[PDB]
Design a protein around this ligand. Structure first.
Ligand SMILES: C=CC1=C(C)C(=O)N/C1=C\C1=NC(=C\c2[nH]c(/C=C3\NC(=O)C(C)=C3C=C)c(C)c2CCC(=O)O)/C(CCC(=O)O)=C1C
Length: 240
């Protein structure tokens, strides 16, 4: 739960809403704590004169190797919400991912997706059915998916909301993704010892293709140096 968070009170409202939505979702799962390095659950430093604060929260269930929720205020001009649910290979579940970049003015970037971990790079029929029983929802000002953005799926959103209306429907869309994703996880069956290997490759590839985003690495580099930043990227953000 986030009632002990020191950052939630000062974060963009849309960020708050998503963190709440994500917590509500994970609480319905048989959550087991995930151990992150002793000094990385809560990080505080300075980036060009501004206070940089990060709160990391991690959990896991038999079907999710690592469920990570990251909240950050990089100075007082930038807010961050980073969330990733790492699928335990043996179950072949898709990759849930959500990211929000915001500032005082508002939200400049919001992206959520259920990334296929299969080699076919597709989603289970069960997902496709449920996702479509909802229908294509709004959205204005889509965004450019990068060359390293191949790892993503298609039902994936990515926008710059406009009013407190395209925000609430972004949130609501994430809630729907999570509901479908959680439900399909309590009824996922162990795959083969061949296939599991492939799903583990599916995640390894993901973590690396996403790390192609030196925007997070660069900021952590300027604040803590490259050795610390690299340990954060490989230990917290995208462990192999
Ligand atoms: C999977 C997606 C993804 C992952 C994994 C990820 O790490 N970022 C992700 C995406 C993403 N980030 C974005 C931007 C910014 N993020 C930070 C900083 C930090 N972000 C952090 O998480 C931490 C801890 C930071 C600092 C400590 C800054 C400085 C900016 C530039 C602000 C801007 O120009 O809008 C954008 C917009 C870029 C664009 O549209 O061209 C996107 C798409």
């Amino acid at each position: 739960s986030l009632t002990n968070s020191s950052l939630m009170p000062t974060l963009n409202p849309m960020i708050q809403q998503l963190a709440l939505a994500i917590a509500a979702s994970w609480q319905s799962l048989p959550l087991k704590p995930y151990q992150l390095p002793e000094d990385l659950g809560y990080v505080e430093g300075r980036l060009e004169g501004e206070k940089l604060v990060i709160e990391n929260r991690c959990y896991q269930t038999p079907q999710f190797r690592k469920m990570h929720l990251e909240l950050a205020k990089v100075g007082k001009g930038l807010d961050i919400l980073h969330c990733v649910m790492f699928p335990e290979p043996l179950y072949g579940l898709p990759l849930f991912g959500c990211d929000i970049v915001a500032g005082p003015g508002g939200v400049s970037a919001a992206i959520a997706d259920l990334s296929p971990t299969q080699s076919d790079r597709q989603l289970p029929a069960a997902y496709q059915k449920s996702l479509a029983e909802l229908g294509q929802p709004e959205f204005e000002q889509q965004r450019e998916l990068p060359p390293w953005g191949e790892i993503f799926s298609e039902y994936c959103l990515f926008i710059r909301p406009s009013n407190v209306t395209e925000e609430e429907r972004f949130v609501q869309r994430v809630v729907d993704f999570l509901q479908i994703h959680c439900h399909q996880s309590i009824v996922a069956e162990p795959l083969s010892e061949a296939q599991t290997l492939e799903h583990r490759q599916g995640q390894i590839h993901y973590c690396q293709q996403q790390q192609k985003n030196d925007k997070t690495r660069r900021d952590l580099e300027k604040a803590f140096g490259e050795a610390w930043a690299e340990r954060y990227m490989s230990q917290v953000l995208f462990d192999v």
